[PDB]
């Protein structure tokens, strides 16, 4: 189905992004297996997504760059939580 410990739920995605924007963020941490923006809030202001890295080692690289489950980028903050 999936690879244990390689996947993330993504919240607080900016409204303008598409799946390639989400991909570009996570490609800097390792290889990406799967990346989807799945929908958006009722107000249309934030989006929810899912990213699977290619390997647990790639996902651990993501984890090393979080702070309290937040991925703080140049102009955004993503809430990143493990998929189980």
């Amino acid at each position: 189905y999936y690879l244990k410990d390689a996947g993330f739920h993504i919240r607080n995605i900016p409204k303008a992004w598409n799946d390639w924007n989400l991909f570009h963020v996570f490609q800097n941490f390792g290889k990406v297996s799967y990346c989807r923006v799945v929908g958006q809030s009722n107000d249309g202001q934030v989006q929810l997504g899912f990213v699977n890295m290619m390997s647990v080692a790639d996902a651990d690289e993501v984890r090393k760059n979080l702070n309290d489950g937040n991925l703080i980028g140049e102009n955004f903050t993503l809430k990143v939580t493990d998929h189980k």
């Binding site: 290889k31 990406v32 799967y34 290619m54």
Partner: protein, 81 residues
Amino acid sequence: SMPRGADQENMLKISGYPGMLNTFGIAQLLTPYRVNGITITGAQSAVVALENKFQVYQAVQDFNGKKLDRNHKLQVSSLVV
């Protein structure tokens, strides 16, 4: 061979590898990306269906222009231009 109905965004062309490779060997060239089907198109070329367009994008970046050895250089391109 190839899944009936595959989407072109999942496909890439690969060429230049040694002429004796079989389909499993072509898949080995593309480690670690998920390969769902391979259609051989000549001794040293094939069309490959990967899991999705993100894996195609990364496989092109990883493998296009790769020197396998002094006699073989890979050419990798997405089928969607």
